[PDB]
Design a protein around this ligand. Structure first.
Ligand SMILES: Nc1ncnc2c1ncn2[C@@H]1O[C@H](COP(=O)(O)OP(=O)(O)OP(=O)(O)O)[C@@H](O)[C@H]1O
Ligand SMILES: Nc1ncnc2c1ncn2[C@@H]1O[C@H](COP(=O)(O)OP(=O)(O)OP(=O)(O)O)[C@@H](O)[C@H]1O
Ligand SMILES: O=P(O)(O)OC[C@H]1O[C@H](OP(=O)(O)OP(=O)(O)O)[C@H](O)[C@@H]1O
Ligand SMILES: O=P(O)(O)OC[C@H]1O[C@H](OP(=O)(O)OP(=O)(O)O)[C@H](O)[C@@H]1O
Ligand SMILES: [Mg+2]
Ligand SMILES: [Mg+2]
Lengths: 287, 287, 288, 288, 293, 292
């Protein structure tokens, strides 16, 4: 009567990473190419392959149960809706470790920027007018907008705007168009959100199972099994944060699980205190 | 000291290449330097702006560019979205292109009955072109709900999001893939060349006029052909009828057609007893 | 079936060139990707996108009306069938100017070959055992076979056979595997064949229309409009071969005419040796 | 002085997975482009990159020593050969954990199938006529065949046959062409077979070394080092949930090696018994 | 014994050279990374070599003809004149391809009124000889920094005040904080011949090939033009197109006449617009595949 | 002021060098064809230069460290010693990548050994390394210096033989030649400009080197767990001279014991087979991501 409906961006780098995570969590399915409803083989789950821009909208209107989407698109649509008294409520279940990107202010290379107040009175081009307003209201700076749905980087050289606010990762497009990033106003990752309202306890249990699995996939990526050699224990313990007590062994030899990746800096700190520092990977876990 | 003529063309898409091709066939020289979105003409006082197609009517309507290449569908949808918010919406149409053809069509599920528009009365319809859909349904006097999606419209029926859809179509591939059939053409679009409203410096006026006359000539050369054939003298008046064109045939008949010869026309000519039908191309012309 | 059914190889260089020719002849259709029956929008025609290997078989069993296929696959299947008294009759409508390739005998680079008789008693690997037999029987030379359905070029170095008979265009694979082409046994192009038996006169008329159009597409590719500059006219006429040249008005000068073949440099040079202001214009479309 | 000759499919899914396994077993070699005989650098082994369809043929004619091939192609060729009294004997050394796929009967979507008997008298298209016959004889149902070398999915919509028997995984091709899978007739994996007859004891020892290593490569894929905390209550139950060879070692803490992959379901079972800090470490290489 | 022709093995210059030999009716197929290539239908061998070695090979008589950038030719001529090595050759024809330009570039945030602003600055280049030729001609002293590539590194790295590189996009310059400020050499590809005497057969062959290349160029440039003009305007139209043969004229009533003729250049729009202005009509331009005066 | 490192701009050698700096915790992103690259998290500049210029730059002190083929380093050292130019530098570490070999090749159709080259003309892009080789074999030859497409020379009648870089024989077979003699086997190397550093910059190079050592040691090393008879333990220890002292745990019973330890090399199958032969069982090898 009702399977769990999950909205994923149809095509994009964000799509593969979302499909990959559902599969790493033991959700089996095949995309029957260009068909946009995908039925899970082994679980009572439907995938809807939609434009990312529509996903907050769908989640907010209860029309799907779960949704994978950029924090940037989500917050922009929430604000566009709050501006029209449209329902804008949802529950955030988990932040992904992917889809990273940032909304940044950019100006022409040949231009001085001491801070946000240097934009007071200038026109700014953006595809994220709401997130730009939120930032400039917070900095108390007045500006004009120039709304373009893309090719934002055109606007300054084209005499359309004094500056822009765009998504950025590399800065290739910026250099190409005579611009430099000068201010991060929003840092986004993908996020997994849930429609508002009540859930059948079966469907509740399913989402809980899925989430616990996602937690495990992340914890295995991050965590590491560390073995080292003597008798300077408590300081070493502090230098390697983790959940459980380290087991201390025979000839001292310490075995334990880090919660974070071991960095070179940390390894170097340990030699400065320790010897035979090993880090083994962890394929799978559940605390 | 003066602002160059600024022309907006879609940055990336089918429509982009065909527009760049035509400016070059009209003797406008320019080279695209990668992801740079302002392009300066080498030999003419012209700038190109490589923007999203959806923003072009917007730009033209706000006078911020001079000329714009855009789908008749995007243009009419944005004119209506704007008239609904008392925003500018005025522009002048210079010329319809012989490219960018496509149609907005209503589609429903394959195994479902459609006698005519009235069968949609009260159904919810998903579309990226809410205004053009409204225009059509008001003309047919049928009431319906909308469901706005920014893309992947074809998802909506199978997903239980809407009873039907209104999408761009050519082949039907996406429709068949998603369990739908086109049942009703509501808008037929080609690309068009529009001009911002208001006054033009007579230099810039003269330039647009030169460009238009050249565009006419590049189209006339595509359409026109030099034809040479042998016929029975008796069949002359009939042959004349079969080949519409501007000038009289010379004497063996030599002449220039205004339309492309189809096979069917050539077969008609052999039937009149004409022989050695040649069609030579015309690279360039000006009546 | 009441629509004309045409078999085309599904995917391959041969596929594009076949679709292209049907479209140049005014047959409109869209491949709805991975769907293997394609219905024409504007003509009573179905396309079946099948393996090339099955097309002679389908044409011979009347199950399709027309078929585009390599002359090599066609003749091999005809012979495999004649060997099992299976129906192997069909009608060839036209040879294509595409799908060119050749079955060639290849041996190891460091090996001597004075002619076919140097293969007498040797084992030969091929995916075309029938065409190989036809060749060797014609040369009266006895040999063993080693049948492999591909990667034929492996056989000598692998000690499977003394030589091979493979399709060739470049010879990349041959050099890579230590071999040289030494003898062309079969030259193939694609060909358009028709099932045997009777046709409804409507369906007959349709195939005839299509063929006349294909003839015109080819004739326009080959032909050229030539204009040049009084004695030696009859000789010039001979040098440029299907109509009288119209004799120019402007003595010192003159000539306008249509060649049936491409003008080659050699021919142009011959003309200067006799002529001046030699022009060649293309012909987009024609019907003699 | 003849090296051990191993046949692997030249190009396909099955190729990479076979090359990968030879390398994981310490056979070094480099593919030099379109070259089809590949010599091992460090072992007395040649690889032959041939069409998969020819591999059972080669193994059965003793012309190669070992062969990697789909169980489906192998059984079809054994039967096609037994039907022509050609040599069809070989020895199966080991079944691979890759190349999974299944031959399935498919019919048109909007058509009823209660079971095999619904096919009695229908024509069926397939590239695997023998495996289809084997299945239908077992179910005692009579049918016609329509042999196609590929694009089988065309046949029903094209009016060439009532149903088909094709390889299937997702169903994409089937949906695209108006068909539904309704009956699995053969489940295949890749398999490693040996030519029949005697082996020199050196070459025997080498195949045995290779097999023992393959066993170890598989055992390392399957096996995992698991570390967890549990109540001493529910220990015997935990033992049952993690099958392996050795007893688990046990301050708190259980260390052991599983013989199977831990699934999420099993990990969830363990948390339910009240176990905590469940780790699974990979094993690159092993030998019991 | 055959005609030996050197062409750059791989590069934009390679395709355009192979294309031209084929358009001239020389048949051959490249079998991958095979570098000595025989023509099927003509007594001609192709050598696929590095562009930098081609002037060298032609100058040492080891090949007969060579396709190469004017820039690498002049750089090697000078490198050789500096070592009293043979630097003599004959130039047969300038190509209408292989365009590129050696330019001086300096840091964006720096003042440059002209070449004299380089006096005493260090300059990086892959073309040390052409750089010297330029600086001698402007009478300016400078230091060099020779690098075989990645020239654009030098200024940002504090290796050099300026650079002289091949320049095309501008992207690399902007990326590295530089601006082109001065063109020192504009190159096209050229076809050169080894020095010495030729067997008259081999002479005749090169002459045939050259005449064919002339024809391929003349067909690119030329157009068959058909128009209507007032008979009074004909002589004037003739004057406006010095690129023309004498037109064949036919009457149509007697006001206008129909003119058919071959231009030597393409008609620009501007010229076509000039013709409408004289009161000509129905100006058509047909392409020409192949031709020979 | 900051540490300047030269790496080949584009080539297989480039990726492997960038990869190693990142595996050593140096953060940076290449913004297209920008050639001076600043590290985000360390006082380190990267220069993306042509490989041929790297020895030159290191030798002229203009950069601090340089990643480069042993072959181009030795060729430029010799080109320079021939012009009394400074050719001094310090070698920090040999890489386990950038393998390739300069080989002599002649026409397929007689070569008994190097003396068969006496008096023949030879084409190469490495004229110095060719001279070094021929001097070492005491053989005289003519040269033909070309910057590339060396394999042309014999078929073209320019030269009797060639000396080229080789990996596959493809180009050789294509052009009617056979490799007959390896004259130089190269790997990439990490070299340092000559002179004094400043103890900050000294400390940094030392940190980087120790990290590179650790990345290599983790590639090579393995955590091995096995069962053996207690009697066989000392013998097993001997068989793995690559080992730490094993932690040994008794089972259940006292017959077999369980041994956990770290090899310095990977275990070959052959070694694992040797261990089963001593009557060890349940030989497991786990990977090691990182170590020190
Ligand atoms: N088959 C087709 N489907 C869609 N648009 C088509 C088609 N054929 C022509 N067009 C034309 O292309 C125009 C824009 O094409 P394009 O594919 O760039 O659109 P888009 O995907 O909406 O782009 P954008 O990134 O601006 O949203 C349409 O407005 C229409 O006029
Ligand atoms: N989804 C799949 N569909 C078909 N075969 C599969 C699939 N997955 C695995 N296989 C296996 O791969 C084997 C051969 O793979 P491949 O795709 O190269 O075959 P092929 O295209 O029939 O090859 P050939 O060129 O020899 O005709 C099959 O016989 C089967 O055992
Ligand atoms: O079915 P065809 O005639 O081949 O046309 C393909 C259709 O698919 C696209 O729209 P769609 O809304 O499906 O794409 P989206 O994922 O961008 O929303 C495109 O705009 C075409 O209309
Ligand atoms: O349906 P899926 O599980 O996605 O499997 C893909 C299908 O593609 C192949 O058939 P195809 O129609 O391509 O036949 P051909 O190889 O002869 O063209 C293969 O036999 C599979 O059945
Ligand atoms: Mg759009
Ligand atoms: Mg197969």
């Amino acid at each position: 009567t009702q399977r769990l409906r999950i909205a994923i961006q149809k095509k994009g780098r964000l799509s593969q990473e979302c499909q990959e995570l559902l599969k790493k969590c033991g959700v089996k399915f095949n995309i029957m190419g260009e068909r946009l409803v995908v039925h899970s083989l082994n679980m009572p789950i439907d995938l809807l392959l939609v434009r990312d821009d529509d996903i907050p909208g769908l989640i907010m209107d209860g029309v799907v149960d779960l949704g994978f989407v950029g924090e940037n698109v989500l917050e922009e649509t929430r604000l566009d809706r709050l501006a029209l008294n449209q329902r804008n409520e949802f529950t955030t279940l988990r932040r992904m470790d992917f889809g990273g990107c940032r909304l940044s202010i950019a100006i022409e290379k040949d231009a001085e920027y001491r801070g946000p107040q240097d934009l007071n009175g200038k026109r700014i081009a953006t595809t994220y007018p709401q997130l730009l307003k939120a930032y400039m209201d917070r900095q108390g700076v007045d500006f004009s907008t120039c709304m373009l749905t893309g090719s934002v980087e055109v606007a300054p050289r084209a005499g359309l705007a004094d500056a822009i606010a765009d998504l950025v990762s590399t800065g290739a497009t910026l250099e190409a168009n005579g611009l430099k990033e000068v201010e991060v106003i929003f840092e986004s990752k993908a996020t997994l959100i849930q429609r508002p309202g009540a859930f059948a306890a079966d469907k509740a249990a399913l989402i809980d199972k899925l989430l616990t699995r996602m937690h495990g996939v992340q914890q295995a990526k991050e965590s590491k099994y560390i073995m080292l050699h003597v008798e300077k224990l408590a300081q070493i313990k502090t230098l390697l944060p983790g959940a459980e007590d380290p087991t201390v062994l025979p000839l001292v030899a310490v075995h334990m699980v880090s919660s974070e990746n071991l960095f070179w800096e940390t390894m170097e700190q340990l030699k400065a205190l320790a010897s035979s520092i090993l880090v083994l990977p962890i394929e799978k876990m559940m605390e």
